[model samples]
Target: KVFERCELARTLKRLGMDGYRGISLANWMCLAKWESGYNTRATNYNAGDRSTDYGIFQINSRYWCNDGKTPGAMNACHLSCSALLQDNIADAVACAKRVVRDPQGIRAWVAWRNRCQNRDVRQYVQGCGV
Candidate 1:
């Protein structure tokens, strides 16, 4: 699902991502824009760690999810990595919610730190009527 920016903005807002754990909807948009460009099926293998980042949010197999192949993995989200790859983002949203329950909040995503944090992230949700 290669979604347009506004489409994804509205979708995330509808999914109640507008203010999940003090993380604003615009911030989530920035993370998704950098992480996977709104493509739901996006996947990246981390050969060094023998883990993979899956789906739009690029949730990793190292700790956040289980792929049944990553060594020393923990399914902290308590769901399979496959759940993140679907066009429907419901499960992905849930796993993301679980991730933020950690002290890191949205900072768990390095992509968000480098690209979305301390910036004018309002551009992400602007013009989307979100």
Candidate 2:
């Protein structure tokens, strides 16, 4: 499912992700934009590493989820990779919160590191009232 920017922001806020777990809404919005452009079904397969990133946050199979086809997956989120490619973002948000608790925090997402970190992304939620 494709969501409007404000809609996505609202959802994130409802999920208690608006700075609730040390992740600002701006950073979340920026990561979502760079990772998946708010598309729930987004998936990226990296042939170099033989791994795939799934959903809006692009949670990796390397440590966060298991696609079953991917060998030696940690499946830290303890859920199917396909589960993340859905309109319902509850599971995704839950898993993402876990990711944030890691030492890397939101920097666990490369997109966040490259684009959101050390940047003022307040424009991401300028009019969303988030």
Candidate 3:
């Protein structure tokens, strides 16, 4: 599911991520854009590690989700990888909150580290009036 920037912001706000979870909406939007271009169905496979990243947040199969074929997947989110591909992002949001609670915080997302960290991303939510 592709969402407009404002729509995504509103959703994230409702999920308590609009600067309420130690992560700003702009940063979340930036991560979403870099991770999946706001498309919920996006998936990327890392051949080097033989792991898959799923959905808009690109939650990994190795630690947060189960890809079924992957042996010994941690599945900390207790959710099927397919659930992240749905239009509704409740599961993804819940899992993302857990990921953020880790010591690495939002830096758990490499996209946030390389692209959003230390960057002024206010433009991401500028016109949205968020």
Candidate 4:
């Protein structure tokens, strides 16, 4: 998997989030495998504007350009509104950690995987505790 090759994996490990707790690397990898097949340049069709959510994370255009803020809005560095297109691994990992930390656990994140119905590796995604 590209995850093993990318610096993101090491970054997660360094941040102490290798599992579901920190960066949720395993969970994120599963989503990436499902969504983009490990392609860092993956894009999805967003029928609305006929534009695409770009990159490995499939970040949306609005999140990249719009000046809006949600309660759980990411920090300045992690936001696509900033310079996420640069593909800074550190920032991405930090942003991911924030998401995992906000809910106080990875239960919500696991729920995300459940919604996708990706049970091929149920044990790895669900059984691997935080």
Candidate 5:
């Protein structure tokens, strides 16, 4: 499920991402653009940690969700990592919210920091009216 920019913007906004954890919607939009291009089924394997990054937000299997393959995984999200691959983003959004509850907050997403932090991220949601 690859979402259009505006489409994803409206969805995220509707899911209360507009200003979650002091992080603006534009920032979240920017992260999704870079992290997985808003593709819900995106996956990236980290061979070193023997873990996988899944879904639009690329939530990690080692700590956020369990794939039953990542050794010593914590399953912080308390759901199967497969849930992140679903077209519906509710689970992914919920897990993302959980990540920010830590002290690192939105900084938990390195891609957001590199491509969105302190930048003109509003363009991501431009014309979306989000």
Candidate 6:
């Protein structure tokens, strides 16, 4: 989902990675919107990981970007964008399915909610769906 990806990138930008990391916020938005309609519940439509991802962030489990121990470790991992590891928005989306399994993931959801309250162009989040 282009919207989801852009929203994610926007989140990362807020965390301090927009120009510094070379990721274009506008492009991220277009891509996320095209990829998953900003729906974290969206799936690959083909194969791989089945249903192990979740939310607008769409992170996976086996290769969860984060360490899996911290509340939002996965979020941090996504920002890392490690090639060998599931760290970017793409990988993070897949892992989100599993990460969200934690009811506490509501924290992640809330974080998104609070941060996106003022982002207009990206319109990254319709709502955290918390």
Per lDDT, the best of the predicted structures is: 5
Compared with the true structure, what per-residue lDDT tens digits does model 3 show for residues 24-106? 89999999999999999999998877889999999999999887866677899889999889999989998998888889989
What are the Cα lDDT values of the candidates?
Answer: 0.92, 0.90, 0.89, 0.47, 0.93, 0.40
Cα shift from native, residue 86, model 5 (Å): 0.4
Q: Which stretches of candidate 3 lie over 4 Å from their true place?
A: none
Mark the regions of model 5 whose C-alpha exceeds 4 Å error after superposition: none
Full ranking by lDDT: 5, 1, 2, 3, 4, 6
Q: What is the lDDT of residue 21 in candidate 4?
A: 62
Candidate 4 scores a C-alpha RMSD against the true structure in Å of 6.3
Q: What TM-scores do the predictions have?
A: 0.96, 0.96, 0.95, 0.49, 0.98, 0.33
> Model 2: runs farther than 4 Å from truth?
none
Off by over 4 Å in 4: 1-8, 20-24, 49-52, 61-78, 102-130
- Which ranges of candidate 1 are over 4 A from the true structure? none
Q: After superposition, how far is residue 80 of candidate 2 from its true place, in Å?
A: 0.4
- As for model 6, its CA RMSD to the true structure in angstroms is 13.6
lDDT tens per residue, model 1, 6-120: 9998988888888899999999999999999999999999989899999999999999888999998999988999999999998898898889989999999999999988899
lDDT of 5 by residue, 11-102 (tens): 99999988898888988989889999999999999998899999999999889998999999989889899999999999999999999999
Worst 10 residues of 6 by lDDT: 79-88
Clash count (model 1, backbone only) = 0
Candidate that scores best on TM-score: 5
**In candidate 4, how many Å is residue 4 off?**
5.2
TM-score of 3: 0.95
Score candidate 3 by lDDT: 0.89
- What TM-score would you give candidate 4 relative to the actual structure? 0.49
Stretches > 4 Å off in candidate 6: 1-17, 41-51, 65-130
